[PDB]
Amino acid sequence: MKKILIVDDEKPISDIIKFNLAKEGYDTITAFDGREALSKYEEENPDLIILDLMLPELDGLEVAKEVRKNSHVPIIMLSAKDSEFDKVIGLEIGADDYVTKPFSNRELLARVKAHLRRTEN
Amino acid sequence: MKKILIVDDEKPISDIIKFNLAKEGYDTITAFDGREALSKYEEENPDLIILDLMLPELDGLEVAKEVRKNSHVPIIMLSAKDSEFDKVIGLEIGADDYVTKPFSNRELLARVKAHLRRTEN
C-alpha cells in the first residue's frame, strides 16, 4: 500500500484526513510539528506528504525545503492562508500542490490519487 | 525550451495565458476546440497542456481521455465549474491539476512550473 504522511497541528483535521485516506486503502502516519514531520519523513519513507503550512517549531515551507534537499516525494500543502502570494511561494519552494482550508475531502483524496499516479508514470 | 499547449475557446483568456507563459520563456501553441487540441497535441508534442473544460467539438474531459490513451503529459484543467464534483471527475479522468476560473496568472504559472518540474524528476 501507499503511505501518506499527514502533518497538521490540529488533531481534528488530521483525523479526518487520516480516516478518509484509510477508507481508500492508504497507510497513514501522522506528525503534528515540523520537526516531527521531518523525522517521520526520514524514518518511514512516505509516498506522499500532506503538509500544513502553519506548524510548531518549523513551518510547512521550512519542512518542504528540507524534504527537497533529498527527495522528490510529492507534497500537497494545506493552508488557511489563501493568498495568491502564499500559493506561489509554496509551489516555488517545491510543493507539488497547494490546497486551502476549508477543503473538500474528496477533492484532496483525488489530488492524492492524481499525484501518486504521476510518481508511477 | 518547454512547449505549452493552451486550449480554450475564449481567445481573450487564451491570449492572457499565452502572454504570461511567453514572458516566462515558454513556447506556446493554441487550440480553440477539443478536436484541434488533439491534433495539435499529436503533431506538436507539448510538454504540458492547459485544457479548458467547456470546449466546443469535444469537451476537456474527452480531450483528456483521448490524450491519456497514449501519454502521461501533464494536464492542467481550467474550469468555470467551481463544484467539488467537477474537480474530482477531472482529476479521476487523468487531469494532473484542476484550476477554477477566474484564476491568478502567477498561480497558474507556478503550477505550470511545478508540474513540468515533476516530469524532470
Numbering used by the authors:
A (entry chain A), B (entry chain B): 1 to 121
Article excerpt on this structure:
To determine to which domain the 2-AI binds, recombinant N-terminal VicR (VicR-N) and C-terminal VicR (VicR-C) were generated and examined in the pulldown assay with the biotinylated 2-AI. Western blotting revealed that VicR-N and not VicR-C was captured by the biotinylated 2-AI (lanes 4 and 8), suggesting that the N terminus binds to this reverse amide 2-AI. To define the binding of VicR-N to 2B5, we attempted to solve the crystal structure of VicR-N in the presence of 2B5. We obtained diffractable crystals and determined the crystal structure of VicR-N using molecular replacement. VicR-N forms a dimer in the asymmetric unit. We also identified an unmodelled density surrounded by four negatively charged amino acids (Asp8, Asp9, Asp52, and Glu10) within the experimental structural map. To further investigate the binding, we docked 2B5 to VicR-N using AUTODOCK 4 and determined a binding energy of −4.98 kcal/mol. In the docking model, 2B5 is close to Asp9 (2.5 Å), Asp52 (2.6 Å), and Glu 10 (2.9 Å) of VicR-N, three of the negatively charged amino acids surrounding the undefined density shown in the experimental structure map. Further, we have demonstrated that the lead reverse amide 2-AI binds to the N-terminal signal receiver domain of VicR. This binding may inhibit the formation of the active VicR homodimer, which occurs at the N-terminal domain.
VicR is a response regulator, which plays an important role in S. mutans growth and biofilm formation. Along with its cognate histidine kinase VicK, it constitutes the VicRK TCS that is involved in regulation of cell wall metabolism, nutrient uptake, osmotic protection, and biofilm formation. VicR possesses two domains, an N-terminal signal receiver domain and a C-terminal DNA binding domain. A typical TCS consists of a sensor histidine kinase and a response regulator, where the histidine kinase senses an environmental signal and relays the signal to a cognate response regulator, which in turn modulates expression of a cascade of effector genes.
